[PDB]
Amino acid sequence: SYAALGRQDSITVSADGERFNVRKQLNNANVYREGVATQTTAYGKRTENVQYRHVELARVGQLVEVDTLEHVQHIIGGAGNDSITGNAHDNFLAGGSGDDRLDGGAGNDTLVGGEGQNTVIGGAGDDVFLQDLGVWSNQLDGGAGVDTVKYNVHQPSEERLERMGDTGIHADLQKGTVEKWPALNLFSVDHV
Amino acid sequence: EVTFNITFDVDSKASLGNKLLLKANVTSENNMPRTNKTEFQLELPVKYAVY
Numbered sequence A: 001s002y003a004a005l006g007r008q009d010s011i012t013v014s015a016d017g018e019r020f021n022v023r024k025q026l027n028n029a030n031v032y033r034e035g036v037a038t039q040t041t042a043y044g045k046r047t048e049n050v051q052y053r054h055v056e057l058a059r060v061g062q063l064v065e066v067d068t069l070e071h072v073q074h075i076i077g078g079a080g081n082d083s084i085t086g087n088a089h090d091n092f093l094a095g096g097s098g099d100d101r102l103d104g105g106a107g108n109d110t111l112v113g114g115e116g117q118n119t120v121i122g123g124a125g126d127d128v129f130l131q132d133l134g135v136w137s138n139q140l141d142g143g144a145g146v147d148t149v150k151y152n153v154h155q156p157s158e159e160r161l162e163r164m165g166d167t168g169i170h171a172d173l174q175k176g177t178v179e180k181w182p183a184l185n186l187f188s189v190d191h192v
Numbered sequence B: 001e002v003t004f005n006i007t008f009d010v011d012s013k014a015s016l017g018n019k020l021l022l023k024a025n026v027t028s029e030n031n032m033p034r035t036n037k038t039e040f041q042l043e044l045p046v047k048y049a050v051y
């Protein structure tokens, strides 16, 4: 879970078979680092000094790190704009908040785009898309095989009931659009 | 030949998408086969007022 990453950060996950290479780009990251403090004492005459370790917080600007993952099937991105890619197994790819790109690759994968304007590619196999009746627009591609998009996972919120009432979605697979706020805004549409 | 204007009222909370279509065809008692002259439809862009 990379959910501790902020909005300004990002990850880029690439598959090398069964192994994953994760490139993390953290902008103005905050990191603990250990140095050497120095406390001094005078004892009535010429001074004797000491030192000791000291953990502390600092922001070190731009950081790039390359993590490595093995035997990992599920990844959760941070609050930024992540690019996450899976492999031939069954993966749980979640993007969280931000304009994330999720690609599952082969196999039966489950794909959760989260908030933001997400683009999601399923690949081959039978894939599952989970949606949340949000205000953003999403781009969804299923690929080969029989695929499913589900809108019933989340309970509707209070402001949704206040602004919309008891109306849900207007979905049409010939047009390829799913309108999550019909007749209230025309740009909260998922394209499938 | 007859020429005339037909007036319509557009609701202020209308939902017509971005593209509205009108369809009209003529008919008579003689009941003769339909022809391209009998049918006509034309398409008009739509915009929504925002303040």
Ligand SMILES: *[C@@H]1O[C@H](CO[C@@H]2O[C@@H](C)[C@@H](O)[C@@H](O)[C@@H]2O)[C@@H](O[C@@H]2O[C@H](CO)[C@@H](O)[C@H](O)[C@H]2NC(C)=O)[C@H](O)[C@H]1NC(C)=O
Pocket: A186, A187, A189, B017, B018
């Ligand atoms: C401005 O909007 C047009 C139209 O968007 C469509 O109609 C709206 C009412 C809303 O329902 C949108 O979700 C619709 O997509 C955009 O033009 C369309 O662009 C898409 C690709 O982006 C294309 O597939 C459509 O054919 C286009 N349709 C028309 C009529 O042009 C246009 O791109 C938007 N402008 C900007 C700058 O985003």
Ligand SMILES: *[C@@H]1O[C@H](CO)[C@@H](O)[C@H](O)[C@H]1NC(C)=O
Pocket: B024, B025, B026, B027, B034, B038
């Ligand atoms: C006119 O168009 C309507 C469209 O619904 C159709 O039902 C009707 O049969 C048409 N009539 C003629 C005379 O073309």
Ligand SMILES: [Ca+2]
Pocket: A077, A078, A079, A080, A081, A082, A095, A096, A097, A098, A099, A100
């Ligand atoms: Ca994210």
Ligand SMILES: [Ca+2]
Pocket: A086, A087, A088, A089, A090, A091, A104, A105, A106, A107, A108, A109
């Ligand atoms: Ca996969």
Ligand SMILES: [Ca+2]
Pocket: A095, A096, A097, A098, A099, A100, A113, A114, A115, A116, A117, A118
């Ligand atoms: Ca997201």
Ligand SMILES: [Ca+2]
Pocket: A104, A105, A106, A107, A108, A109, A122, A123, A124, A125, A126, A127
């Ligand atoms: Ca897949």
Ligand SMILES: [Ca+2]
Pocket: A122, A123, A124, A125, A126, A127, A142, A143, A144, A145, A146, A147
């Ligand atoms: Ca698929």
